[PDB]
Amino acid sequence: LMSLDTALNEMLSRVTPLTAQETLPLVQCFGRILASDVVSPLDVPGFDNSAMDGYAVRLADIASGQPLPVAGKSFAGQPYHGEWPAGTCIRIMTGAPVPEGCEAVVMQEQTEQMDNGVRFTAEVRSGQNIRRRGEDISAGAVVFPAGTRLTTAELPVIASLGIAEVPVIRKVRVALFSTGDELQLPGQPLGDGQIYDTNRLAVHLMLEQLGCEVINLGIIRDDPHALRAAFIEADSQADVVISSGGVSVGEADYTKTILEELGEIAFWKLAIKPGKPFAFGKLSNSWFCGLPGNPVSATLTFYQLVQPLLAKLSGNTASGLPARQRVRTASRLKKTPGRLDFQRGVLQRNADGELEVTTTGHQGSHIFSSFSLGNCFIVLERDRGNVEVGEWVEVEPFNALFG
């Protein structure tokens, strides 16, 4: 019944971005959120310089319509600090500081030389080919705003300004655990109607990849006290606590009563597929997210619900989810109205070089293979029914969490 958009907004609207911070050397800043604006301490370039290599001139002598002889020259880091006779021009090479009083620079290709004077050609519009100091970055200016996720794109720029460290928001801390007597650890023998715990591993990997500090409390035994203990501990050192499975997401049982006892938890029924149930609310000092037991369902719910909440909490101003794009289906897709279906597909280039999607196969949640075989989500609109080969469809490519 409830819609993804609704739950998402309801979730993000209640959360307050972290503000605690620490200062680290650039090399340790990948994926981190800048705590404050980065203001440039210097100008870049620090002085007016040549856009092309050619000739530095004064709009005056260009009226002579006669050859201008090179009085001097200015290169890389060897400016021309000398007298500039009238009617003459300076030989200059890109990045080189324009000469005192230079009104324009001309690319030699736009000026046939001579063995006695430089003949110009196309009029020389003022300021042509002159990069003015602070044109790129002017001292005092804001280079990168707070809330920016530092990447290979920004850190080297910050280093170019001479800064060795920057304040970043502390990593988000997340407590993780599962519960259920039927859950067994890898390496351990499978009991009667037992199964190996897999959701927890899934959530742990994603959290780490998302840059969070993970606190894995393991499998909690089916006991009212063990569970309460687990929650008290999780809430005490994490901003968010996640149940990868076992704790109630609606159904009645002791886990449900412990949840209601320890916080304000809502039990939503999202109109999505796979999945539907999701637990969300506030514990004493953390946010709680409860995932359904089904592997496909938990992964999907975490990826579309928890991920965005972690992005906001982190201080990051960009919506930490990939963008969608319209593409054509090359597979008939089975879809039932009433739920927003996040099917898995395979985005690929066709013969004509265009992008099309193929289903990964069976979309049932009884298997996990679709995540490996696919590379995207074919997000089918809630109201839509079956889709025929050739129809337009929305696609959301997987991010680094899946390859």
Q: Which of residues 29-58 bind a second copy (CB under 8 A)?
A: 30, 42, 45-47, 51
CB of 289 to a second copy, least distance (A): 17
Query: 142 - beta bridge partners?
Result: 39
Which of 92-100, 113-121, 258-266, 272-280 is the region at the interface with a second copy (rule: CB under 8 A)? 92-100
Structure tokens at 13: 């609207």
Question: Which of 20, 39, 60, 76 is in the footprint of a second copy by CB under 8 A?
Answer: 76
- Name the nearest CA neighbour of 358 among 305, 395, 304, 319: 395
Question: Which of 276, 371, 377, 378 is in the footprint of a second copy by CB under 8 A?
Answer: 371
Judged by CB under 8 A, does residue 77 bind a second copy? yes
Judged by CB under 8 A, does residue 180 bind a second copy? yes
CB of 337 to a second copy, least distance (A): 16
CB of 46 to a second copy, least distance (A): 7
- Name the nearest CA neighbour of 352 among 331, 330, 333, 378: 330
Q: Which of residues 214-273 bind a second copy (CB under 8 A)?
A: none
- Binding string to a second copy for residues 138 to 177, with x set by CB under 8 A, is what? ------x----x-xxxxxxx-xxxxxxx------------
Query: 240 - beta bridge partners?
Result: 174, 287
Q: Rank residues 101 and 193 by Cβ distance to a second copy and give the closer one.
A: 193
Q: Rank residues 122 and 153 by Cβ distance to a second copy and give the closer one.
A: 153
Q: Rank residues 75 and 267 by Cβ distance to a second copy and give the closer one.
A: 75
CB of 42 to a second copy, least distance (A): 8
Alpha carbons 247 and 9: distance in angstroms, whole number: 24
Give the count of residues interacting with a second copy (CB under 8 A): 83
Question: Which of 37, 123, 196, 383 is in the footprint of a second copy by CB under 8 A?
Answer: 196
Given the DSSP bridges, would you call strands 355-359 and 325-329 parallel, antiparallel or unpaired?
parallel
Given the DSSP bridges, would you call strands 277-282 and 183-184 parallel, antiparallel or unpaired?
unpaired
Judged by CB under 8 A, does residue 136 bind a second copy? yes
- Name the nearest CA neighbour of 241 among 305, 286, 200, 304: 286
Neighbouring residues of 213: CB distance < 8 A, sequence distance ≥ 6: 171, 172, 173, 174
First to last CA, the chain: 32
Judged by CB under 8 A, does residue 26 bind a second copy? yes
Judged by CB under 8 A, does residue 197 bind a second copy? yes
Q: Rank residues 144 and 231 by Cβ distance to a second copy and give the closer one.
A: 144
CB of 283 to a second copy, least distance (A): 25
Question: Which of 269, 282, 324, 382 is in the footprint of a second copy by CB under 8 A?
Answer: 324
Q: Rank residues 281 and 295 by Cβ distance to a second copy and give the closer one.
A: 295
- Name the nearest CA neighbour of 182 among 223, 222, 229, 224: 222
Task: Write phi, then psi, for 167 (nearest 5 degrees).
Answer: -80, 135
Question: Which of 22, 181, 260, 391 is in the footprint of a second copy by CB under 8 A?
Answer: 181
Task: Write phi, then psi, for 269 (nearest 5 degrees).
Answer: -125, 90
Judged by CB under 8 A, does residue 206 bind a second copy? yes
- Binding string to a second copy for residues 345 to 364, with x set by CB under 8 A, is what? ----x---xxx---------
Judged by CB under 8 A, does residue 2 bind a second copy? no
Question: Which of 110, 198, 307, 317 is in the footprint of a second copy by CB under 8 A?
Answer: 198
Report CA torsion sign: 352, 354, 358, 360.
Answer: positive
Q: Is 218 helix (H, G, I), strand (E, B) or coil?
A: strand
Alpha carbons 167 and 43: distance in angstroms, whole number: 22
Judged by CB under 8 A, does residue 99 bind a second copy? no
Judged by CB under 8 A, does residue 101 bind a second copy? no
Amino acid making up residue 257: T
Burial class (CB in 10 A: 0-12, 13-18, 19+), 393: buried
